[PDB]
C-alpha cells in the first residue's frame, strides 16, 4: 500500500518516473556542448560566499562530462563512470572508447527503470571525449538510458533557445576560439541577457589528449573577445 511502483508502465507505454525526472532536468541549469576541429567544448551556467566546478567533471584523461539535473545523482554516476573507464583500461590495456563508456553508464541508468522498485537517476549528461577510432565525440544521455550523438546540443533550462542559436551559428570549420565564442553566445542567449557575466560560466575543452578548465580570468578574456565582435 506504501509502494509507488516506480518501474511500471503507464497506460500510454510511458514511464511516469522517467517523465518526471526529465522535467526535473529541464528545470536544471543549462549546459551546452559543441565540436570544433581543435576539440570539444562544454559551457554551463552555475550566494556570494560560495568558494568549484559543479556542472563539468572529468571522467578520464580523454573523457569529461557536463551535468544537468540532480547534483548528487550526477556525482554517483560520475564516480561510476570513472570506475568503468578505469576498469576498461585495466581489462584491455587501452583507453575506453567514448561510446562504450556512454553505453555502460546509460545501461546503469536504464536498469533503474527496468529492475527493482527504486527511482531512476534524475540526471542527464553531455559526455565529450576523444578516441582514435571516432575522433571527437559528444553524446547526450537522458534519464531512461537512451543516448544520442551530436555535433552540438544543449541540456537544461531553455535548451530550445540554445539549440536554435547553436544550429544557426554552429559550422563545421570553426576553430577552438570561434567555438568558445559561440559557446559564450549561446550561454548568453539562453539566459535572455545581452552580455554574459563571467561568474556564471563554466567553460572547458578537450583537445589532442588534454583538458582545459577555464578559470575566471580566461573567461573574462573570452568575454572581451566576444564583446568586440
Amino acid at each position: 500500500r506504501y509502494d509507488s511502483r516506480t518501474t511500471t508502465f503507464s497506460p500510454e507505454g510511458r514511464l511516469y518516473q522517467v517523465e518526471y525526472a526529465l522535467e526535473a532536468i529541464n528545470n536544471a541549469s543549462i549546459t551546452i556542448g559543441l565540436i570544433t576541429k581543435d576539440g570539444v567544448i562544454l559551457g554551463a551556467d552555475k550566494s556570494k560566499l560560495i568558494d568549484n566546478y559543479e556542472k563539468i567533471y572529468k571522467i578520464d584523461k580523454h573523457i569529461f562530462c557536463g551535468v544537468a539535473g540532480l547534483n548528487a545523482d550526477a556525482n554517483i554516476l560520475i564516480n561510476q563512470s570513472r570506475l568503468y573507464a578505469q576498469r576498461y583500461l585495466y581489462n584491455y590495456n587501452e583507453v575506453q572508447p567514448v561510446s562504450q563508456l556512454v553505453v555502460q553508464i546509460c545501461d546503469i541508468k536504464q536498469s533503474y527503470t527496468q529492475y527493482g522498485g527504486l527511482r531512476p537517476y534524475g540526471v542527464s549528461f553531455l559526455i565529450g571525449g576523444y578516441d582514435t577510432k571516432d575522433g571527437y565525440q559528444l553524446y547526450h544521455t537522458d534519464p531512461s538510458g537512451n543516448y544520442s550523438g551530436w555535433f552540438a546540443t544543449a541540456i537544461g533550462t531553455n535548451n530550445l533557445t540554445a539549440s536554435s542559436v547553436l544550429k544557426q551559428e554552429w559550422k563545421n570549420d570553426m576553430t577552438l576560439e570561434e567555438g568558445l565564442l559561440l559557446a559564450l553566445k549561446t550561454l548568453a542567449k539562453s539566459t535572455d541577457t545581452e552580455i554574459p557575466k563571467s561568474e556564471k560560466i563554466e567553460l572547458a575543452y578537450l583537445t589532442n589528449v588534454y583538458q582545459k578548465y577555464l578559470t575566471e580570468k580566461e573567461i573574462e578574456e573570452l568575454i572581451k573577445l566576444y564583446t568586440q565582435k
Partner: protein, 222 residues
C-alpha cells in the same frame, strides 16, 4: 517492487502491462523486413535533427552475429539491453554448440527472454518489438517477428512500429514472392515510405546475404 509482481491478470483476463508495452512499440519508428530466395532487406525509419545530431550514432539495424541481424521498434534503451543479451546468447550458443546460432533459435531466445520479463516479479516488460533476419541450419533464410508479450512468428514480409497496419496491408498486395535484390530493395522502400516523409534522411536500408550484412550507400536511396 523488488519482488512485487508487475504484470497481473485484469478482471477481463488481460495482462495490461503487455498492452502498455505494445503501446510503447506503437510509439516507436517504423521498420520493414522482406525475405527473398537467399537474402533479406531491412529498411528502418530514422529521425534526426539536421546539422546537430550525428546520424551515425543511432543504429536500429543491428548485426547480432556473423549471420543474424536485427531491427526493433519501441524503447531504444530497452532495445539496446535486449540486443546485448541476444549477442551474448549467440556467442554462448556458438561456444557450447560449436555452430553459429540459427535465426530461429535466436528469435526463440528473444521471445523467451521477453516472456520471462513478462512473468517474473520485480521486472518491467520490454517495450520493444523486433524483426530478426538470418539463416537456418539448412542455410535457408528466415525472418521472425517477436512481440513484447513474448509471442513470435515467422513471416515473408513484415512491418513493425508506428502505422504498422498500413505497411502490412501494402506489403500484402505487393510482395511478389521471389524478387531481385534491386527491386526487392525498392519494394522495401516504397512500402516504408507510405508512412514516413519521403526523404533519404528518413530511412536506412540494409541487405543481408550469406556473406554479410551490407548497408546500402545513400546514392542508391537517392
Amino acid at each position: 517492487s523488488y519482488d512485487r509482481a508487475i504484470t497481473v491478470f485484469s478482471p477481463d483476463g488481460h495482462l495490461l502491462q503487455v498492452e502498455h508495452a505494445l503501446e510503447a512499440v506503437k510509439k516507436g519508428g517504423c521498420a520493414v523486413a522482406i525475405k527473398s530466395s537467399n537474402f533479406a532487406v531491412l529498411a528502418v525509419e530514422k529521425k534526426n535533427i539536421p546539422k546537430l545530431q550525428n546520424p551515425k550514432t543511432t543504429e536500429k539495424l543491428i548485426k547480432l552475429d556473423e549471420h543474424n541481424c536485427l531491427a526493433f521498434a519501441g524503447l531504444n534503451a530497452d532495445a539496446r539491453v535486449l540486443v546485448n543479451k541476444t549477442r551474448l546468447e549467440c556467442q554462448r550458443y556458438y561456444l557450447n554448440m560449436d555452430e553459429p546460432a540459427p535465426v530461429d533459435y535466436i528469435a526463440k531466445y528473444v521471445a523467451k527472454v521477453q516472456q520471462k520479463f513478462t512473468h517474473r516479479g520485480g521486472v518491467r516488460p520490454f517495450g520493444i518489438a523486433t524483426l530478426i533476419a538470418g539463416f537456418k541450419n539448412n542455410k535457408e533464410i528466415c525472418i521472425y517477428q517477436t512481440e513484447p508479450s513474448g509471442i513470435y512468428a515467422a513471416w515473408k514480409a513484415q512491418a513493425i512500429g508506428k502505422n504498422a497496419k498500413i505497411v502490412q496491408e501494402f506489403l500484402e498486395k505487393n510482395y511478389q514472392e521471389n524478387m531481385e535484390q534491386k527491386d526487392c530493395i525498392f519494394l522495401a522502400l516504397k512500402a516504408i515510405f507510405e508512412v514516413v516523409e519521403l526523404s533519404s534522411k528518413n530511412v536506412e536500408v540494409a541487405l543481408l546475404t550469406e556473406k554479410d550484412l551490407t548497408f546500402i550507400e545513400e546514392q542508391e536511396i537517392n
